[PDB]
Design a protein around this ligand. Sequence first.
Ligand SMILES: Nc1nc2c(ncn2[C@@H]2O[C@H](COP(=O)(O)O[C@H]3[C@@H](O)[C@H](n4cnc5c(=O)[nH]c(N)nc54)O[C@@H]3COP(=O)(O)OP(=O)(O)OP(=O)(O)O)[C@@H](O)[C@H]2O)c(=O)[nH]1
Ligand code: MG
Ligand code: MG
Ligand code: MN
Length: 664
Amino acid sequence: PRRAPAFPLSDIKAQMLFANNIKAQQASKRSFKEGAIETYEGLLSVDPRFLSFKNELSRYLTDHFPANVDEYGRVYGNGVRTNFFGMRHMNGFPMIPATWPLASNLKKRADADLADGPVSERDNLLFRAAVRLMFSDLEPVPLKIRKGSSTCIPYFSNDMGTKIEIAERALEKAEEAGNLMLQGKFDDAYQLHQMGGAYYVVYRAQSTDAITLDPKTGKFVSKDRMVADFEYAVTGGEQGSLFAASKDASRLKEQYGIDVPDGFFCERRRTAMGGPFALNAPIMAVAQPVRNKIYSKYAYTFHHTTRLNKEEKVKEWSLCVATDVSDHDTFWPGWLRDLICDELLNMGYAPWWVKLFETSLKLPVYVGAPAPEQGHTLLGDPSNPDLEVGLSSGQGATDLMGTLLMSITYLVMQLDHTAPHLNSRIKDMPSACRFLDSYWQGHEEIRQISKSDDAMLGWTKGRALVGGHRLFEMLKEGKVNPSPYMKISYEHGGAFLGDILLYDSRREPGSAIFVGNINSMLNNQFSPEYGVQSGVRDRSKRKRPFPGLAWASMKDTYGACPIYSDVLEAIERCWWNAFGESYRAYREDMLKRDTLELSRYVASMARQAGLAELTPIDLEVLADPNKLQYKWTEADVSANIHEVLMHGVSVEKTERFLRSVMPR
Ligand SMILES: Nc1nc2c(ncn2[C@@H]2O[C@H](COP(=O)(O)O[C@H]3[C@@H](O)[C@H](n4cnc5c(=O)[nH]c(N)nc54)O[C@@H]3COP(=O)(O)OP(=O)(O)OP(=O)(O)O)[C@@H](O)[C@H]2O)c(=O)[nH]1
Ligand SMILES: [Mg+2]
Ligand SMILES: [Mg+2]
Ligand SMILES: [Mn+2]
């Protein structure tokens, strides 16, 4: 029932997605590639000492610090959620094949029994009220662009000057492109303004993934990751198959002569979509202002920074429920995209801009190389965007889309199972708006803190509380999905935005605290997602600009973990056995070196002034700017630092553009 149309690279529809320049042409042909990452300068991820080290350290920590998570998924004690075997992957070598992205998720949602539109008028009112509170009184800001990022689509440029140009040109022609699309002229819009085309699909690494040790066999087992072949992806799952990707690393010996120790596997690979920059710029121009609004006015449920920032809110609750959403992005509903557009039109947003936005959520995807001998296929017709991939990762507002979907979904789950007495407060748009406004500010007896699919649901004392406990119990039994919109369950080892909520014997929000996830310290130091890219001169353009700085924020980020010291000591001891050196000393040097290299990028830094002024956040971000795209926002990072990583378009250019978009 409607297979998505598909075109090979050689087809003209695919060829037009790539400009006549070397970069674009190469991106279109890039074949499957693998190899050890350069974990740290001079250290390959498959280095025998390094794998020996990982073998001993993971076995030791698992053995001495088994998980402390109760039947309700709350973690207590040692603050450990699971074993430490996740670090056992040959980083840089992926599971084969990666998945083909689903062209349509309608069947996937229907088969999972999720609704195909708001199920009640109340719900419809709440989603629309969310659009209203989020997109209403926006203040222009400048359009910030990540240094070294690709404009993808037709040009695949990384040059800042070229990006700035593209973005400014896009803010000037967005209106005319939008109108062309309203007339059904997508090709004209793509050809004249590069707004359209496709998302460029690239596979990324989730460096660590669950592994277990079968006490029976003494053998390790990697978690199966299901992937869809092409047939399955273009037919929405109607045909083709869904199967376990192979994580088996034996092949590395045979193929590259790399020695594979027992119990080491290939990495899990996730899909990433690079959006066509001319189309995303007009969207990012509105999206940042929305973020500024929800982070300020609705800071209670949406602005999260420190462990204490979150702790303050949750400590006042009588019950805290850590939720989990299964595969959020691919389940995200296109009907919400259409509801949001509809409400934006109602609020008075420019039609051409809503059209740009709507189209960015229906765009075809160009699949590059999921496995050797596979790929180079465009899914969907750019002449008539109509894909239902769910939520595309590089769209300019994917975080807002997930947050709008989930924040309401969690509220609905609270109303449905614990606070029916609040329904009478939601009768129409005005009252829905008032109620959501109050709820989002933490003023109701039911509350939440969330960011897209990560969240914690709260109940203060009151009528809803007894329901809250029944909901939790429903989640623990896990036989009934509590939401009609997405598959929700409880997180096993509850955490929020990286911080584990540590409970004591009371097992209550009031006497619980937020600590760092010690396992993540280990993932970040021994299993980064990218190599150090030392051949890239401009450090600011690297995926990991200054790896050494994370050493200076380690105590800050993980100090509160019950087993912090023990882990540092096991590391030191295992590093000695593997490398005959002190790990601490190795890091202190890397920390000194990167501190000096940093002063060359920061103006306000003397050619050796210390890290004195920088916050823990600043450092974690300089060592891994990726956290700026899922954990923190420009606002949480010092300004002299933010300029190392980003550049912007003038406020006057975006101000004039915002004005033409908004109602008032
Ligand atoms: N580890 C991980 N998880 C990732 C992921 N992309 C998407 N997920 C999904 O997030 C949840 C929770 O996973 P968990 O390992 O329990 O905790 C993660 C997660 O909450 C968060 N996080 C890391 N990377 C991302 C990301 O790109 N997007 C989102 N939305 N959330 C992310 O950080 C916690 C700690 O991660 P870790 O210590 O492994 O550090 P990484 O540097 O490896 O993260 P990365 O994004 O790769 O740079 C589950 O549904 C999971 O499927 C991902 O990449 N890694
Ligand atoms: Mg999960
Ligand atoms: Mg990361
Ligand atoms: Mn969580």
